[PDB]
Symmetry: D2
Subunit: 360 residues, 4 copies
């Protein structure tokens, strides 16, 4: 069997504006039953208590389930819904719809490698596990599972790994206590452990070097981790390439070197299959289907030898995404770009992945 | 009487960090008596009640007067102090020190036109004038006066005009901008009633005296700098910045080389909120956002700095308005 | 036809937490078909683009229609859903569920006047009407209609009037233009408030000119305005009574106290725990003050970028300090120095 | 010698508005040379990078020094300048000017105990000390020194202890590393400082202190500590307000504990124990007897209030909101917007002190 993945980027005027999204299926353009991921940007704060984000999640699930003719509960483990809140500046709220179907015959004429999607699920992550080696392990297992689901064995062909974990709630800690266990305290821990899990499963870090005392040098260049809610089941969404891919897309990745750097974005675009020096032409820009950039706050308050306010700013989270969005969009000309972050900090360095067209 | 203008960009770790600024003069590198403008970015909100901004203003004046050996009151109309609050993201707080002296003796091999600075003062602007034609007129007079002070007569050689007006705010700014338009012939005076590509207007305080700071070019310039300008087409556009850089004298297609980047001394970009919430055919949140003022500057700073690689860039704006934002660049000549 | 109004205040841990709300009906405690108003506080910004607020609105409707066995579209003109965003400080997010049944025996036991609820609907308010006398008039009609629905004729027995109006969109302005008409949120609110004043005789239709009891808000494109009115009447079978007061300045508790007292609680300065518990709900609108002078001193309340949030924080602190109940309906934050506050207490 | 302390509360329309402040001295009403503390509220964010706060600090010092006829550097260790940023809602920015002179003879007719002010200085607090027992100890020493400076030996007569400590700067950590020491910021310094106060006042036994329980064992606290930290200055500072029988002051201080975020009883207890006799409300006259309130409104320990969920810990504007609430409470009782409402940092009981008039018979 050969995998055929597609991406459709549709706008949202509000967290609950599913008009264009529904039109995608109503028009016959996309089969709702083949949808494997929804990756969205919503308007709002982007903070841990952003209810708009949840609103978008709920709305998108309800729309998709309606289009499938199933009740909403069914979508439980069949689709990855990842909504990142906060869409400052040039970032246009949207949802990227990811489909994948498997076909008996490989189309001919497809150059090099092509996009493939894998998904994975963690064993329940108990509150006692959060930020600790148990989480690291369970995530690693899920990532390996996702690599297998995508039919990928070379980790250098894995270009983006999104992990959704749980965070510590008061009900969670109460549960831990009620079973005589302790907790690390929250979201910062879950995220770090998750990132480390990715690093382990992709061989970027040796498992021997992991311990609860060293969790919070050891990095993944392609991890995009987030945490929240009470759901103990973690989830992995993996985007890679393979020679067996029937997709008309290819993914690449890069590392943004500092807060003002465009080269990481460019590298993502270029390694995905677009050939250019400095700028993209309109046509080349249009070949870029989606960019997934995580713009976490920098490691320091020094930028090109000068002091910046980016760590001191009460609005740091918002500002970081604003800057990232400005950069990405200035290159691609496409406001509907997936700009996540600015939680906390390759030192100084942020991941960015690009999905571009791969034509026969 | 050739004019020789220079710019020295020095960092500030805080609104009252005048260390590097003082070192500029203490080292003999710059003559404090030749300082004609201070143009700074401070950390803070950028809003009308930003006291950090005022803190930077007060601190800078006190430092400069100390370096001059005069008391602070004397600087009253000899130096233009313009502090724009709010330095989000990649913008590094700083002060651009602008000097100008006249020299008897025009030095040989300077290509084309060169940077010149002019300054002007309005008649008192009465509260009854704010946002009305009287303001428009008084500002226009001050701009003409500034053009004369710089020894410039061709308005196509004027590349930046900063106006500082009083408040009782959006009105004062609009009237001031119109004043600039009138004085540069961009708009006919007849078309003005109570019912510019290069204006950078701001207002605040009770001070009835408006102030103009004008940056232009002239053939008679002994300056080792040149200024250019551009128009930012929408919120995601880098072409206006590039045009500013290019027309100032840097020859490039798409990107600058490290050397070329280093040839850019300062950028003065005003990033007012867009005219609409549509950008490249898509909805954006930029007008709805409670932090719009901050975000606009963040975006502008990201753009400018991504091109020049210099965090100490003068990114102002955040005020309210489908596009069209002024940017000036000062480069080596 | 004797009216029996009740209020059930239930917590929400998030805009879409309808657990306690659903349990209200599932337990048999409240009949969902008798629900006439949902009045909620949600977590969020309280600003014009607060989607959490909308999230709560949608969630509440979807929960009430479920408990009614209808689909959600029906709740159409039958229930007033009013969600005020922004719950800073001591304000606990919640929904006050307002039921009203008509019935047969007037009990006795039941001293003086009692709570009654009236509802009303405006003629479509066209964009050309917003902020103008047409709106004033249509709102006035809707308020009169609501007074009638409640069986009240004396406007001195009306103690709270909530108006939901439309605001000006682009699509609205485009509409006005396409028919050659000229348009004038702040506007819609003022006109609505003036409507209430007219209908209650506080201001003479042929003219400093406030309503002491109006609580107005505007938003969306829906041309149909809505009135929710809370009053008293001698014909009321309710175990509750409503009163109102005016908050004199930003630091004043006397308006809250007056609301409580005139609703039927007898106290001088403080309430006892028991008296506190007699207070079922407080509806206070804490709009920004008229000036930046307070007890002879300068305050930052008008300059503050977070003014809207801070005003509610202050109001919530005041109300809750008196009643000891975090689940209090504290709205406002808009720009204007006297604020309305109403209290609903046990009759008993 | 008998101490005579006074307090003059004057408004500020901006961080650098020293008009009313200067008029205080120019009018002869107050002797600038007797000023021992400036305690101010400024407009601004209240956050760690609030430059308006610093602006107020600088402005006040410059004004005071000008009034003294000395240069500003001299005020170095003679005056405690404590500016708390962020004045939301009903809080009117202002500066409370604290004077103290010593007199040979005690005026007669002064009932009970009276206000006295003490000041103290820590040994340099090294970055390796921040949040650790070394800080706890150095602060304790400084508080004992302040108690002695005020002529007070009974810790039950100490009603407010303001500690200004250092915080961990990026250059501080570099220094620590450069000397082979470890570190761990502002929350730590504050906790350690608070513990220092608790130790020096006998509220907590020294034996019970350890680096592993400073932040952990929340049982250990001081009912009267008001701690803050910031800057690079290694020298901590204590400002202590107490009572004594030897006081010639026409004021008396009291304190209370705010039980939860919605509680007025702590404020009331402060007022009452300071010398105002009332049950529930104050009369206008009684209100006017209250000269200043110093309340620290740090965020609550939990998000449960009177059995319900509140947003106060989740809110991105928590720091601001906490002070808005506190200010509402204080001002609702005293009717005086110029009240010293600090806090906003993190943790469910908050200290509040009140200074009222104590008139001769």
């Amino acid at each position: 069997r050969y995998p055929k993945a597609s991406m459709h980027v549709v706008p949202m005027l509000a967290p609950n504006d599913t008009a264009a999204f529904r039109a995608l299926f109503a028009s016959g353009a996309v089969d709702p039953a083949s949808v494997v991921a929804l990756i969205a940007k919503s308007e709002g704060s982007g903070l841990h208590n952003d209810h708009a984000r949840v609103f978008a999640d709920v709305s998108l699930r309800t729309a998709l389930a309606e289009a499938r003719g199933c009740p909403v509960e069914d979508l439980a483990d069949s689709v990855t819904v990842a909504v990142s809140g906060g869409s400052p500046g040039v970032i246009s709220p949207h949802v990227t719809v990811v489909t994948q179907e498997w076909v008996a015959d490989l189309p001919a004429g497809l150059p090099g490698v092509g996009l493939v999607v894998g998904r994975g699920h963690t064993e329940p992550i108990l509150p006692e596990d959060i930020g600790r080696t148990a989480q690291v392990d369970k995530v690693a297992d899920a990532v390996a599972a996702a690599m297998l689901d995508a039919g990928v064995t070379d980790p250098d062909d894995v270009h983006l790994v999104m992990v959704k974990g749980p965070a510590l709630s008061s009900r969670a800690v109460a549960d831990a206590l009620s079973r005589g266990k302790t907790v690390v305290t929250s979201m910062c821990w879950s995220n770090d452990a998750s990132a480390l899990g990715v690093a382990v499963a992709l061989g970027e870090v040796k498992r021997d070097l992991v311990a609860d005392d060293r969790i919070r040098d050891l990095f993944s260049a392609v991890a995009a981790t987030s945490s929240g809610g009470e759901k103990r089941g973690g989830e992995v969404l993996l985007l890679a390439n393979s020679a067996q891919s029937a997709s008309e897309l290819r993914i690449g990745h890069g590392i943004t070197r500092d807060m003002a750097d465009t080269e990481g974005i460019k590298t993502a675009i270029r390694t995905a299959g677009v050939d250019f020096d400095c700028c993209l032409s309109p046509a080349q820009q249009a070949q870029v289907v989606q960019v997934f950039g995580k713009f976490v706050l920098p490691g320091s308050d020094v930028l090109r030898g000068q002091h910046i306010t980016a760590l001191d700013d009460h609005e740091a989270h918002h500002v970081a995404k604003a800057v990232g969005g400005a950069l990405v969009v200035s290159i691609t000309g496409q406001p509907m770009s997936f700009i996540s972050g600015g939680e906390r900090n390759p030192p100084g360095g942020n991941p960015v992945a690009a999905v571009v067209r791969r034509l026969p």
